[PDB]
Design an enzyme around this catalytic site. Structure first.
Site, PDB file in Angstrom:
ATOM      1  N   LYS A   1       0.814  -1.208   0.000  1.00 10.76           N
ATOM      2  CA  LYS A   1       0.000   0.000   0.000  1.00 10.76           C
ATOM      3  C   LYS A   1       0.849   1.260   0.000  1.00 10.76           C
ATOM      4  O   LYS A   1       0.370   2.311  -0.446  1.00 10.76           O
ATOM      5  CB  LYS A   1      -0.942  -0.003   1.202  1.00 10.76           C
ATOM      6  CG  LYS A   1      -1.801  -1.252   1.294  1.00 10.76           C
ATOM      7  CD  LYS A   1      -2.526  -1.510  -0.020  1.00 10.76           C
ATOM      8  CE  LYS A   1      -3.801  -0.699  -0.123  1.00 10.76           C
ATOM      9  NZ  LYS A   1      -4.569  -1.047  -1.349  1.00 10.76           N
TER      10      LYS A   1
HETATM   11  C1  LIG Z   1      -7.770  -2.211   3.236  1.00  9.18           C
HETATM   12  C2  LIG Z   1      -6.511  -2.430   2.917  1.00  9.18           C
HETATM   13  N1  LIG Z   1      -6.094  -3.750   2.480  1.00  9.18           N
HETATM   14  C3  LIG Z   1      -4.933  -3.899   1.621  1.00  9.18           C
HETATM   15  C4  LIG Z   1      -4.227  -5.217   1.946  1.00  9.18           C
HETATM   16  C5  LIG Z   1      -4.358  -6.279   1.115  1.00  9.18           C
HETATM   17  C6  LIG Z   1      -5.210  -6.165  -0.148  1.00  9.18           C
HETATM   18  O1  LIG Z   1      -4.571  -5.334  -1.071  1.00  9.18           O
HETATM   19  P1  LIG Z   1      -5.480  -4.227  -1.887  1.00  9.18           P
HETATM   20  O2  LIG Z   1      -4.571  -3.220  -2.550  1.00  9.18           O
HETATM   21  O3  LIG Z   1      -6.397  -3.517  -0.919  1.00  9.18           O
HETATM   22  O4  LIG Z   1      -6.305  -4.928  -2.939  1.00  9.18           O
HETATM   23  C7  LIG Z   1      -3.718  -7.471   1.412  1.00  9.18           C
HETATM   24  N2  LIG Z   1      -2.963  -7.576   2.528  1.00  9.18           N
HETATM   25  C8  LIG Z   1      -2.831  -6.517   3.357  1.00  9.18           C
HETATM   26  C9  LIG Z   1      -1.978  -6.637   4.618  1.00  9.18           C
HETATM   27  C10 LIG Z   1      -3.470  -5.322   3.064  1.00  9.18           C
HETATM   28  O5  LIG Z   1      -3.333  -4.225   3.924  1.00  9.18           O
HETATM   29  C11 LIG Z   1      -5.493  -1.296   3.009  1.00  9.18           C
HETATM   30  O6  LIG Z   1      -4.289  -1.503   2.704  1.00  9.18           O
HETATM   31  O7  LIG Z   1      -5.858  -0.151   3.389  1.00  9.18           O
END
Ligand SMILES: C=C(NCc1c(COP(=O)(O)O)cnc(C)c1O)C(=O)O
Ligand SMILES: C=C(NCc1c(COP(=O)(O)O)cnc(C)c1O)C(=O)O
Lengths: 475, 468
Positions: free
Chosen positions: B51
């Site tokens: 992220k």
């Molecule tokens: C809501 C969120 N989920 C992203 C995330 C994901 C999913 O990735 P995305 O870019 O949200 O599709 C997987 N693993 C972790 C530890 C994550 O933090 C965020 O990062 O704000």
């Protein structure tokens, strides 16, 4: 472009090193340093430390000379990071790992090395190197008592300094384009400083080499520098020993700076806050030494400092303000604890409740009431939030918004008990509590309820928006 | 060679991305997977998560359109990392950070963003997105109530999918040389999966795209997959939501795999143990989904799986075996807990004391002269000093070496030289628990204070040698 990682890597051992160099402009501006403070972010390696290099390095030598076969046992005394690197190398190439580390070291290192399937034996912290119960002596005992066991002995293995001389210092040279005036390195086993200083002095003799050892170690020269806290235990992990290691060539280094625990930790927290590098305490010690040493330098020249390992190894130890306060260390000039002390002061929640005006008792429900009865009571009482009781502790709070949205979402039946929809994460407080402690508690809990369990007569719920409104009532 | 980092970097923002791709040969051999299971180690970024990219990305967009000026406040609902990335970007480029995150998320994320000078507001875990107490609703409230505040709204900002479509997917394409057969991605905000799948299908339409969603979310299609545990809270953080985010284009993905907490955490621990990648729980979920999806693949074809964030955010949460046992999760096939359970079994220290034959005190303030006289007159080597209201152990070797090292005078009290780290035990305790306790204390003392002796790891190794 993409040169080193543009392909596929066979294992994690191929992802160690190649760490970038970042200019700490903000930290220098904070401390008022004119020259360019460069930071070698060795903590972003695969294992999160510089020692990963030597780990792989030693294994490579042990495999290049045929002295190592599959299934063997590996033993190594370490402060935690070299054990991590050797555990990675063993888990990849099929070796058994047994580590000996003092009890002074953090628990995160122990847990992560346990995750690599390595046996971990702890040694007393106050033990001297000559003792048979020291990590090195106990490692030698284990090698004597175990079959097919090997100690690579990073304190005496030539791979440890030779590889910092081969790849790491060459990395620093290629990143700084040869123009390096000062290089500041922590003094643990002494391999990193020896190798890097030797290579840079060979390819740039004008560069000064400064070593950092904590107050308590005897690695500085002359001994007039160790008289501050002679052989006194310190909290910083990774640097300093009660003996000169075989790889440490103290003649390659010019200056020595003594750093205490308080300065090291405050500077590590300042690094994290101002630059954004999730780094460990030994790096704070190195950066304080660099800030004290390169003060006489001028603009344009570059002072390179190494940050050995990341905050991951000290996540519960010194990133937490509670432990930093238990040891009486100044957190930072600009920090959330100091910010809350300045903004809130001696204000207590009684003052906020008096300035806003509670003059009321929020509704109450027996925590097993049906949704029908609780909706009837909420509609007849006109209130929005309600608090559910205990039976023996407190259950939590509930608002009409969650009521409606969970009823329509197919998660809250009308005949279901109210406990199923209440908020379960809460923090108990008392009218006498200050605003700083409730602000810290709000960092972990969404709500804060007052005076839980005279009689359980709570006055209200407190969230961060209430604190923001209270700050708005001031100037 | 050295192309991207051979120079000097202006700030930590220049250290985001460029994460390597590693082949998990050992993990595949463990689970019996014929194809090449590749792992994109996005946790090796500067902030230790994927992220970070979008964080920087959004800020860049906000600065490229002039919608952001120095000194402003930034607000963002996040499960933890998107807050870390935005906090890094703000601390570097001089912005104020306020984060809204549920109480379900770990404490390490909150502490790490607190070290970055970010305000942290927690929200109830069971709250729905429509609630005014949700992280997104509370973020909107803060935007309304604060001056110069901005929400970049990673759930609806086009930078989040656009940058995974631009740089991340292009990175995986360049390292995999175009030959990609399956792509397994966790479903959180859905930006990363949409971007990566769209770019790879554009440059390789034959590649299948499978999404991973935790048991409890409603992001999988069809809804027959979410009926297992509908809208029930789970322990894995980062993936899954009770609503479809604006950036999530569910039409770009082909398959969906539902994963529970137990499988996710056991697979993350297996990743750490067998491959050596310090990864988070969502990475374990993605890897379990990949192992379930790419089972039909054969040798030569490559299945790439994303490892979102590192173990740093869950050091106390799931790396600790105590919390893994408190939640009833299988540790791993080969783990230290299972190894010690198999080697020791139900053996207690009474059995060791009986097999060895240890038949078997100082008030902690005797002078070193008297203690040396007693040690030489009693022929014993180690001694344990008592309490006054326990202090520790001391051996003659440390005594002599501290006398010669200039740290222990003969007139000094023995408390100054005793070992202060100790662990209490009782004869009824099993060998597995004392072995786990030895991971943190060098010695272990038994049990009125009528203890019989001290037991260390070499004693346990000798006991294991006396068996089999
Ligand atoms: C809501 C969120 N989920 C992203 C995330 C994901 C999913 O990735 P995305 O870019 O949200 O599709 C997987 N693993 C972790 C530890 C994550 O933090 C965020 O990062 O704000
Ligand atoms: C001695 C060991 N640590 C070296 C170290 C150092 C010193 O690096 P040397 O290579 O020993 O010179 C600095 N910071 C940290 C966090 C360290 O772990 C070890 O891991 O065995």
């Amino acid at each position: 472009a993409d040169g080193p990682y543009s392909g596929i890597l066979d294992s994690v051992l191929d992802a160690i090193g190649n760490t970038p160099m970042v200019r700490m402009k903000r930290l220098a501006k904070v401390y008022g340093l004119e020259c360019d403070l460069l930071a070698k972010c060795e903590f972003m390696s695969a294992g999160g430390s510089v020692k990963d290099r030597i780990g792989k390095a030693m294994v490579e030598k042990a495999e290049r000379e045929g002295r190592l076969k599959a299934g063997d046992t590996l033993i190594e005394p370490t402060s935690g990071n070299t054990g991590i690197g050797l555990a990675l190398a063993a888990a990849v190439r099929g070796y058994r790992m047994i580590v000996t580390m003092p009890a002074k070291m953090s628990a995160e290192k122990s847990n992560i090395m346990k995750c690599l399937g390595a046996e971990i034996v702890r040694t007393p912290t106050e033990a001297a190197w000559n003792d048979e119960n020291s990590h090195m002596g106990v490692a030698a005992k284990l090698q004597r008592e175990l079959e097919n066991a090997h100690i690579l002995d990073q304190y005496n293995n030539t791979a440890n300094p030779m590889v910092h001389y081969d790849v790491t210092a060459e990395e620093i040279i290629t990143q700084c384009d040869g123009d390096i005036d000062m290089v500041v390195i922590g003094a643990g086993t002494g391999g990193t400083i020896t190798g890097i200083g030797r290579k840079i002095k060979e390819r740039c003799p004008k560069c000064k080499v400064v070593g950092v050892d904590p107050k308590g170690s005897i690695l500085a020269v002359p001994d007039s520098l160790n008289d501050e806290k002679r052989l006194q235990s310190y909290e910083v992990e990774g640097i300093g020993y009660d003996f000169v290691p075989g790889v440490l060539d103290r003649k390659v280094v010019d200056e020595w700076v003594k750093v205490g625990d308080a300065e090291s930790f405050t500077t590590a927290r300042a690094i994290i806050r101002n630059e954004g590098l999730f780094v460990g305490g030994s790096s704070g010690a190195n950066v304080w030494g660099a800030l004290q040493a390169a003060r006489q330098l001028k603009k344009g020249q570059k002072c390179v400092v190494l940050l050995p390992d990341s905050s991951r190894n000290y996540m519960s130890k010194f990133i937490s303000d509670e432990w930093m306060a238990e040891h009486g260390f100044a957190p930072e000039d600009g920090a959330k604890v100091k910010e809350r002390e300045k903004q809130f002061g001696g204000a207590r929640i009684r003052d906020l409740l008096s300035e806003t005006g509670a003059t009321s008792d929020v509704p109450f429900v027996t925590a097993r009431l049906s949704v029908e009865d609780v909706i009837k009571m909420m509609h007849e009482t006109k209130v929005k939030e309600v608090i559910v009781t205990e039976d023996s502790k407190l259950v939590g709070v509930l608002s009409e918004d969650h009521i409606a949205h969970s009823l329509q979402s197919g998660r809250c039946a009308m005949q279901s008990p109210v406990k199923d929809i209440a908020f379960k994460k809460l923090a108990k407080a008392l009218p006498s509590a200050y605003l700083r402690d409730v602000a810290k508690a709000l960092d972990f809990s969404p709500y804060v309820c007052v005076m839980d369990e005279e009689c359980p007569h709570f006055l209200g719920v407190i969230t961060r928006i209430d604190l923001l409104h209270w700050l708005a009532t001031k100037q």
